[PDB]
Amino acid sequence: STDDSPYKQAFSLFDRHGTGRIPKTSIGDLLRACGQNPTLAEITEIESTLPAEVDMEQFLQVLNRPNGFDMPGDPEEFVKGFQVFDKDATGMIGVGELRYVLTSLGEKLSNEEMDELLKGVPVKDGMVNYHDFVQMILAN
């Protein structure tokens, strides 16, 4: 926790001054490593609230919005949760595992929402190869 290679160590890598602080330019590509890459307007907007120089504290403050890890919404967090019961997954996702992680996160799609999903799909464990869900979700 107090030695994040992709967050703490990586942060130091993008330190042009070497004083544990980084400007909007650095935060841009920095965020890319832990998600995506925004625009200068976005990073500058962040500086408008957090101290001019976005040091380990400033950056971590905005990142850890819900106070702490495993909650803000990290790409590796969601991947690890779904990967629990998805070693290979050759035509099946298994809602049971997806709900176990999401529901335990912050009362996401609990048994209720999943119950309706299982009723629609002619399966006995919400198995659809994680295609029909993402397909309809990205097709609007």
Side-chain angles (χ1 to χ4, degrees):
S1 274
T2 58
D3 36 85
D4 283 292
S5 203
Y7 318 146
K8 222 211 93 197
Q9 203 165 84
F11 169 98
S12 288
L13 317 188
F14 293 176
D15 230 271
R16 229 297 212 199
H17 284 51
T19 63
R21 319 224 175 81
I22 54 152
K24 49 177 183 183
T25 49
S26 283
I27 358 280
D29 34 73
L30 156 64
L31 296 153
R32 121 183 192 81
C34 190
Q36 241 193 82
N37 179 265
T39 40
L40 277 278
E42 164 61 68
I43 22 259
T44 304
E45 250 65 281
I46 302 151
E47 278 187 67
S48 216
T49 49
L50 336 165
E53 247 156 296
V54 178
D55 44 56
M56 287 106 112
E57 196 145 270
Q58 267 70 280
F59 121 71
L60 282 181
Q61 236 77 292
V62 245
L63 193 114
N64 295 300
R65 209 122 159 174
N67 302 85
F69 275 103
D70 204 88
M71 188 160 169
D74 305 86
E76 305 311 285
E77 243 69 83
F78 104 78
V79 169
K80 237 59 63 159
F82 271 63
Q83 269 192 20
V84 171
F85 221 92
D86 276 83
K87 207 95 205 201
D88 209 280
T90 322
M92 59 213 78
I93 201 281
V95 169
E97 180 54 59
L98 101 79
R99 72 169 83 203
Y100 179 79
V101 187
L102 269 157
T103 305
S104 185
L105 246 168
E107 271 88 276
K108 220 333 197 201
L109 301 159
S110 63
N111 183 77
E112 193 199 291
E113 275 43 79
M114 314 268 89
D115 256 43
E116 290 156 280
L117 109 78
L118 258 159
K119 258 280 104 199
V121 189
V123 290
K124 286 164 191 81
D125 58 275
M127 133 174 170
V128 184
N129 184 227
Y130 208 47
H131 265 213
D132 190 83
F133 326 112
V134 189
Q135 178 189 92
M136 197 161 89
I137 270 165
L138 268 93
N140 337 110

